[PDB]
C-alpha cells in the first residue's frame, strides 16, 4: 500500500509497513477458464478446485508480497503467555499440568 515515490511506508519508531484491506478486498473471483486447460487436471483432480486458496500472491501484481518463502499469520498464532517482557496480553495459548 502506501509507497511514497520509491518505496513502501513503514510506521514510525516501530518501523512497520502498512497493510490495509485494500480495494475490492472481499471478492469472489471468477475461476474463469484456463487452469482446467492450463493444468490439464492434476493434483488428484481438484485442479481448479484445489486452486491454492486465498491470499497467496501469484497473480504477480501486488504490493504486499515482496519476496519470501513465507507470509506469517499472526492470527492462529501463539506465544502462549508467560514471564518475560514482550509477550501477548491474551495468551491465546496456555499450558497446564
Amino acid at each position: 500500500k502506501l509507497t511514497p515515490t520509491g518505496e513502501i511506508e513503514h510506521d514510525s519508531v516501530t518501523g512497520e509497513a502498512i497493510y490495509e484491506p485494500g480495494p475490492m478486498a472481499g471478492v469472489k473471483y471468477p475461476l474463469p477458464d484456463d487452469y482446467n486447460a492450463e493444468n490439464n487436471n492434476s493434483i488428484f483432480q481438484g485442479q481448479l478446485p484445489s486452486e491454492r486458496r486465498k491470499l497467496m500472491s501469484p497473480l504477480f501484481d501486488a504490493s504486499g508480497t515482496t519476496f519470501a518463502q513465507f507470509r506469517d499469520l499472526v492470527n492462529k498464532r501463539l506465544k502462549d503467555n508467560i514471564g518475560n517482557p514482550r509477550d501477548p496480553e491474551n495468551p491465546t495459548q496456555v499450558k497446564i499440568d
Binding site: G15, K79, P85, R86
Partner: protein, 328 residues
C-alpha cells in the same frame, strides 16, 4: 549442618554440553520431532477452553504416542540457539520502556524508536546501575544503596534518557549524567537478528559459532585478557534453548489432505534407528529430515518430551512452524 549451591551458569553449562551432544551421524544424539493423533480428544476438543488430558509417561503411554505418530522431523544443531528474553529500550507498548533494573539486558537499534545508530546490527547492553531515587522491593527500605547493601531488589524512579551506546566498557552515560550506567556486550549482526529473533526472545550466539567471527557478533572488540575467551554465554547466563523446526505438507501429504482433523499431540525423539527388513541387519541412525513413522523402526530412539494440545489441523500448501524452549 552445611549449605551449598549450584551456579546459574551450570544451567548454561548443561545446554552447552547438550548443544554439543546433537551429533551429525555418529555417536552423538540425533533428534526427531513427531506429531500425531488425528484422533479426537473428545467431541469438545475443538471448543474454546479445551485442555487435552494431562499426558502420561509410560511404556504404554509411549506406545500410544508411538502408535498415532503422523510424521517425524529431524533437527540440525544450527536450528538450536541459546536465547534470552528480549527487552528493548523505549518500547512504549510494554510497561516501563524507560525504566531499567540493575543487570537487566537491553537490546538497542532493534527498532526506530530503539534505533540510535544506523548501519549496525542490534546491540545488547546490560544496565549496571540504576537511578538513585526509586523503590525497593523490600518495603522497609527507602534507600537504593541500603536496599541493595542488604540485597533487596530496588526499582528506580527515574527513566533512562537514551538507550546506551559505545563498545567501551561501562559507558554508562556515566560522565555527563544519568541514573543508568551501561555495560556493553556484543552486537548482533542483522541477518541473524531478522531470521532468528522472536520479539520475546533474542537469539544468543554459540561459543563455537562465536569462535568463528568475534566481529560479526561485535565481540572482537573486548578485552578478555584470557586470550580468546568466547565463553560469552556465561556472561549472559542464558539457561534457555530454542528449538526451531519446520513442518511441511509435502513430506507428509497424507496428513495434509483436505478434511484432516489434524494432529492433537506432539513428541520429539532422539537417536531413532532406521527400519530394516531383516531384524538381524545392523541398525542405522536416521539422517533424513523427515521419516514416515513407518520408515522408522518401532519404538526406536528416545522421546524425551511428550505433548498434548487441542487439535490443530494441518493443510496442504499451508506451512506450519514449531518453536520449543527448554529452560535447563
Amino acid at each position: 549442618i552445611y549449605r551449598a549451591i549450584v551456579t546459574s551458569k551450570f544451567r548454561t553449562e548443561k545446554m552447552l554440553n547438550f548443544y554439543n551432544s546433537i551429533g551429525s551421524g555418529p555417536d552423538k544424539n540425533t533428534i526427531f520431532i513427531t506429531f500425531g493423533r488425528s484422533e479426537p480428544w473428545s467431541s469438545n476438543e475443538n471448543e474454546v477452553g479445551f485442555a487435552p488430558p494431562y499426558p502420561t509417561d509410560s511404556v504404554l503411554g509411549v506406545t500410544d504416542m508411538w502408535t498415532h505418530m503422523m510424521g517425524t522431523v529431524k533437527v540440525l544443531p544450527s536450528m538450536l540457539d541459546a536465547v534470552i528474553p528480549r527487552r528493548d529500550w523505549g518500547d512504549t507498548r510494554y510497561p516501563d520502556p524507560y525504566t531499567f533494573r540493575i543487570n537487566d539486558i537491553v537490546v538497542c537499534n532493534s527498532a526506530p524508536y530503539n534505533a540510535t545508530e544506523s548501519g549496525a546490527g542490534w546491540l545488547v547492553y546490560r544496565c549496571l546501575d540504576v537511578p538513585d531515587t526509586g523503590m525497593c522491593s523490600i518495603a522497609s527500605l527507602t534507600d537504593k544503596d541500603e536496599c541493595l547493601k542488604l540485597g533487596g531488589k530496588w526499582t528506580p524512579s527515574a527513566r533512562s534518557m537514551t538507550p546506551p551506546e559505545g563498545r567501551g566498557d561501562a559507558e554508562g552515560t556515566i560522565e555527563p549524567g544519568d541514573g543508568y550506567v551501561w555495560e556493553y556486550l556484543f552486537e548482533i549482526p542483522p541477518d541473524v537478528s531478522i531470521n532468528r529473533c522472536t520479539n520475546e526472545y533474542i537469539v544468543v550466539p554459540w561459543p563455537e559459532e562465536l569462535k568463528e567471527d568475534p566481529t560479526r557478533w561485535g565481540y572482537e572488540d573486548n578485552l578478555t585478557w584470557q586470550q580468546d575467551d568466547f565463553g560469552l554465554i556465561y556472561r549472559v547466563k542464558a539457561n534457555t534453548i530454542r528449538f526451531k523446526a519446520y513442518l511441511d505438507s509435502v513430506y507428509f501429504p497424507e496428513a495434509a489432505l483436505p478434511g484432516n482433523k489434524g494432529f492433537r499431540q506432539i513428541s520429539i525423539i532422539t537417536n531413532p534407528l532406521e527400519a530394516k527388513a531383516h531384524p538381524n541387519d545392523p541398525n542405522v541412525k536416521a539422517e533424513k529430515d523427515y521419516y514416515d513413522p513407518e520408515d522408522l523402526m518401532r519404538h526406536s530412539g528416545e522421546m524425551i518430551y511428550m505433548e498434548n494440545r487441542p487439535p490443530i489441523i494441518m493443510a496442504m500448501d499451508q506451512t506450519e512452524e514449531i518453536n520449543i524452549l527448554f529452560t535447563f
